Design an enzyme around this catalytic site. Structure first.
Site, PDB file in Angstrom:
ATOM      1  N   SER A  80       0.771  -1.415   0.281  1.00 43.78           N
ATOM      2  CA  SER A  80      -0.192  -0.176  -0.278  1.00 43.78           C
ATOM      3  C   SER A  80       0.928   1.675   0.048  1.00 43.78           C
ATOM      4  CB  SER A  80      -1.168   0.026   0.558  1.00 43.78           C
ATOM      5  OG  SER A  80      -2.039  -0.834   1.116  1.00 43.78           O
ATOM      6  N   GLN A 104     -10.434  -5.146   1.151  1.00 46.20           N
ATOM      7  CA  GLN A 104     -10.132  -5.712  -0.049  1.00 46.20           C
ATOM      8  C   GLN A 104     -11.485  -6.285  -0.772  1.00 46.20           C
ATOM      9  OE1 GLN A 104      -7.294  -9.101   0.752  1.00 46.20           O
ATOM     10  NE2 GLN A 104      -7.854  -8.971   2.425  1.00 46.20           N
ATOM     11  N   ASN A 123      -8.747  -0.736   0.112  1.00 48.37           N
ATOM     12  CA  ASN A 123      -8.003  -1.177  -0.961  1.00 48.37           C
ATOM     13  C   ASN A 123      -9.297  -1.131  -2.104  1.00 48.37           C
ATOM     14  OD1 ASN A 123      -5.856  -1.114  -2.624  1.00 48.37           O
ATOM     15  ND2 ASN A 123      -6.584  -2.851  -4.067  1.00 48.37           N
ATOM     16  N   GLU A 168      -0.486   9.931   5.030  1.00 45.51           N
ATOM     17  CA  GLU A 168      -1.016  10.041   6.546  1.00 45.51           C
ATOM     18  C   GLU A 168      -0.069  10.914   7.204  1.00 45.51           C
ATOM     19  OE1 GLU A 168      -2.131   6.420   7.491  1.00 45.51           O
ATOM     20  OE2 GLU A 168      -3.118   5.781   6.289  1.00 45.51           O
TER      21      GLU A 168
HETATM   22  B1  LIG Z   1      -1.600  -2.271   2.225  1.00 45.59           B
HETATM   23  O1  LIG Z   1      -0.674  -2.926   1.849  1.00 45.59           O
HETATM   24  O2  LIG Z   1      -2.205  -1.742   3.228  1.00 45.59           O
HETATM   25  C1  LIG Z   1      -2.029  -2.262   4.163  1.00 45.59           C
HETATM   26  C2  LIG Z   1      -0.468  -1.167   4.700  1.00 45.59           C
HETATM   27  O3  LIG Z   1      -1.365  -0.284   5.367  1.00 45.59           O
HETATM   28  C3  LIG Z   1      -3.201  -3.018   1.327  1.00 45.59           C
HETATM   29  C4  LIG Z   1      -2.526  -4.127   1.109  1.00 45.59           C
HETATM   30  C5  LIG Z   1      -3.802  -5.604   0.125  1.00 45.59           C
HETATM   31  O4  LIG Z   1      -3.828  -6.303  -0.599  1.00 45.59           O
HETATM   32  C6  LIG Z   1      -1.993  -6.490  -0.865  1.00 45.59           C
HETATM   33  C7  LIG Z   1      -5.607  -4.556   0.439  1.00 45.59           C
HETATM   34  C8  LIG Z   1      -5.421  -3.871   0.821  1.00 45.59           C
HETATM   35  C9  LIG Z   1      -4.270  -3.115   1.838  1.00 45.59           C
HETATM   36 CL   LIG Z   2      -8.582  -5.764  -2.752  1.00 49.41          CL
END
Ligand SMILES: *[B@@]([O])(O[C][C][O])C1=[C]C(O[C])=[C][C]=[C]1
Ligand SMILES: [Cl-]
Length: 363
Positions: A64, A120, A153, A273
């Protein structure tokens, strides 16, 4: 003298080494931008099986943290007048006309306040245009748009996809052909070239099962970047100095440094953030905690967008099944940090490493 370099290495070793042991992290790369100069510290193994060591050019999944790249592309679309943050989402994709996305803004999508889009996509939605289309067409808010933040996401992924549509090209193409070159990033990929695969670290999960991220719906927008510590620090340096880029890209980066609301100690921008700086380690851990990722929170909307600069720490965690990343920078101190690992280890521990390094630099 050698004292400064010795001190920085001792500081970074002291922050990193116990956390790697404690979380059984096979390999970890640190990059720090301090007083306009980059510093790299590499630890352990990119692959346990072949003994390949981590270097500043090793590619890690950043999960993310990709959302900050997605936000930068949206910043470009915004500051080029192809979309506006108060546009309804359905303005940019006809398939969404007549759905509840008629009443959801682009800002709501970007900042996770559309009304309960989940963390998700459900397992039933594969990486397929038609399935993604059908998912959004049928979705209905749990609560009023603009009221509650639920990290998501599908939310920011749609924001990125709509930004690409507003520009008239696929998201992935825009990133490869325009965004990454504009930022000077040649070791940053959505789809790692065959010729660069030797640099791609292995990820490690439970029982040290090997884990590299597989295809998923809006993976590019949400979590798809693989990059090196050196390239991610170049992106941090672009964030610390947007004025060094060609003006359209400077504006795109600036658009990611604007806060819209607060939850607790955290001010939400596009991707980034932010926190007041200094703040306690416990508070920065709490802002990056599991409940912040998994539970809804009522927002405190700001009267006008707030400049995320000066005595603030901007950050983002990123995770995939096999990897754990963290990036933090302090605009008013010209200070940036990247910590990339090939295990998904707790956010609190990532923040612990970062805080020790930042603390030590203050002294
Ligand atoms: B992302 O990495 O956020 C999490 C850490 O703050 C994220 C990844 C996903 O799939 C790989 C799904 C939602 C968020
Ligand atoms: Cl996702």
């Amino acid at each position: 003298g050698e004292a400064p370099a010795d001190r920085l290495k001792a500081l970074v070793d002291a922050a990193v080494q116990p956390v790697m042991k404690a979380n059984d992290i096979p390999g970890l790369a640190v990059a720090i931008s301090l007083k306009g100069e980059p510093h790299y510290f590499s630890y352990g193994l990119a692959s346990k099986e072949d003994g390949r060591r981590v270097t500043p050019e090793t590619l890690f999944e950043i999960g993310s943290v990709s959302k900050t790249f997605t936000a930068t592309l949206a910043g470009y679309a915004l500051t080029q007048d192809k979309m506006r943050l108060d546009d309804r989402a359905s303005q940019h994709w006809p398939a969404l006309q007549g759905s509840r996305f008629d009443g959801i803004s682009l800002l709501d999508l970007a900042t996770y306040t559309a009304g309960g889009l989940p963390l998700q996509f459900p397992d039933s939605v594969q990486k397929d245009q038609a399935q993604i289309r059908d998912y959004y067409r049928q979705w209905q808010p749990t609560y009023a748009p603009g009221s509650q933040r639920l990290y998501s996401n599908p939310s920011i992924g749609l924001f990125g996809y709509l930004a690409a549509r507003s520009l008239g090209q696929p998201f992935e193409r825009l990133m490869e052909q325009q965004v990454f070159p504009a930022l000077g990033l040649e070791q940053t990929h959505l789809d790692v070239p065959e010729a660069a695969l030797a640099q791609y670290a292995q990820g490690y999960g439970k029982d040290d099962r090997p884990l590299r991220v597989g295809p998923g719906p809006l993976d590019a927008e949400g979590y798809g970047v693989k990059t090196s510590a050196a390239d991610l620090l170049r992106f941090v340096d672009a964030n610390l100095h947007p004025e060094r880029l060609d003006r359209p890209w400077a504006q795109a980066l600036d658009a990611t440094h604007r806060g819209y609301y607060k939850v607790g100690d955290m001010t939400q921008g596009l991707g980034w953030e932010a926190y007041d700086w200094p703040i306690s380690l416990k508070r920065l851990q709490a802002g990056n905690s599991t409940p912040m990722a998994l539970q809804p929170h009522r927002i405190a909307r700001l009267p006008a967008p707030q400049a995320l600069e000066g005595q603030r720490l901007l950050n983002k965690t990123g995770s995939t099944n096999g990897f754990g990343a963290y990036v933090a920078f302090v605009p008013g101190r010209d200070l940036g940090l990247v910590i990339l690992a090939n295990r998904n280890y707790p956010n609190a521990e990532r923040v612990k490493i970062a805080y020790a390094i930042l603390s030590g630099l203050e002294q």
